[PDB]
Design a protein around this motif. Structure first.
Motif, mmCIF file in Angstrom:
data_model
loop_
_atom_site.group_PDB
_atom_site.id
_atom_site.type_symbol
_atom_site.label_atom_id
_atom_site.label_comp_id
_atom_site.label_asym_id
_atom_site.label_seq_id
_atom_site.Cartn_x
_atom_site.Cartn_y
_atom_site.Cartn_z
ATOM 1 N N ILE A 18 40.427 -31.503 -21.779
ATOM 2 C CA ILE A 18 41.699 -30.876 -21.398
ATOM 3 C C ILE A 18 41.831 -29.439 -21.890
ATOM 4 C CG2 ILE A 18 42.719 -33.192 -21.435
ATOM 5 C CD1 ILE A 18 44.126 -30.622 -23.771
ATOM 6 N N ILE A 21 41.935 -26.232 -19.485
ATOM 7 C CA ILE A 21 43.065 -25.834 -18.638
ATOM 8 C C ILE A 21 43.447 -24.359 -18.798
ATOM 9 C CG2 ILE A 21 44.896 -26.503 -20.250
ATOM 10 C CD1 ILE A 21 46.253 -27.828 -17.767
ATOM 11 N N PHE A 22 43.146 -23.742 -19.941
ATOM 12 C CA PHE A 22 43.459 -22.323 -20.134
ATOM 13 C C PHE A 22 42.541 -21.426 -19.304
ATOM 14 C CE2 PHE A 22 46.788 -21.801 -23.338
ATOM 15 C CZ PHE A 22 47.028 -23.120 -23.599
ATOM 16 N N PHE A 25 43.279 -22.156 -15.269
ATOM 17 C CA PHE A 25 44.454 -21.537 -14.640
ATOM 18 C C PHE A 25 44.344 -20.015 -14.580
ATOM 19 C CE2 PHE A 25 48.108 -24.798 -15.131
ATOM 20 C CZ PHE A 25 47.308 -25.772 -14.592
ATOM 21 N N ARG A 47 56.707 -8.814 5.100
ATOM 22 C CA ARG A 47 57.722 -9.816 5.420
ATOM 23 C C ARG A 47 59.161 -9.316 5.277
ATOM 24 N NH1 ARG A 47 56.317 -14.350 2.041
ATOM 25 N NH2 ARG A 47 55.776 -15.877 3.658
ATOM 26 N N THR B 15 54.375 -16.787 9.970
ATOM 27 C CA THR B 15 55.644 -16.224 9.492
ATOM 28 C C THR B 15 56.711 -16.285 10.580
ATOM 29 O OG1 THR B 15 55.129 -13.944 10.104
ATOM 30 C CG2 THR B 15 54.446 -14.686 7.926
ATOM 31 N N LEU B 59 53.181 -25.476 -21.327
ATOM 32 C CA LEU B 59 51.903 -24.849 -21.681
ATOM 33 C C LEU B 59 51.991 -24.267 -23.087
ATOM 34 C CD1 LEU B 59 51.038 -25.256 -18.696
ATOM 35 C CD2 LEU B 59 49.883 -23.062 -18.897
ATOM 36 N N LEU B 62 51.304 -27.131 -25.485
ATOM 37 C CA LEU B 62 49.875 -27.442 -25.547
ATOM 38 C C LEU B 62 49.126 -26.399 -26.370
ATOM 39 C CD1 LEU B 62 47.688 -29.393 -24.668
ATOM 40 C CD2 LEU B 62 47.445 -28.110 -22.582
#
Lengths: 50, 64
Positions: A18, A21-22, A25, A47, B15, B59, B62
């Protein structure tokens, strides 16, 4: 990837399981900015104005 | 016919559909299409901000 490899060769083994995960991501977050993001000066359309 | 099935599509069509979806959605709740300001967008963005703040906090736990 070099930082993680350097730490694994050094023997810390902190990113195993685990803990990974750093790096995971972050690698994904970098991917979003380089491929998508927003257009430059020659790409005025977006947009909010279309 | 046309428009039916799983044919190819482009980014301007993606879009374009989301604009028609927003405009028709407010016609069911507010009964007008003037859309002076677009509150459906803001109410959705506030939820996304709520979820993101929850993820940032766990996070942080953790990391501790």
């Amino acid at each position: 990837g070099g930082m993680v490899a350097m730490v694994f060769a050094s023997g810390s083994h902190v990113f195993g399981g685990i803990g990974s995960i750093f790096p995971l991501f972050m690698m994904v977050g970098i991917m979003m900015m380089m491929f998508r993001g927003m257009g430059g000066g020659q790409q005025q359309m977006s947009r909010p104005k279309l | 016919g046309s428009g039916y099935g799983l044919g190819l599509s482009t980014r301007t069509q993606v879009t374009g559909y989301q604009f028609l979806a927003r405009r028709t959605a407010m016609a069911l709740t507010r009964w007008r299409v003037r859309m002076e300001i677009e509150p459906g967008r803001r109410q959705t963005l506030a939820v996304v901000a709520s979820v993101s703040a929850a993820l940032v906090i766990c996070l942080g736990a953790l990391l501790w």
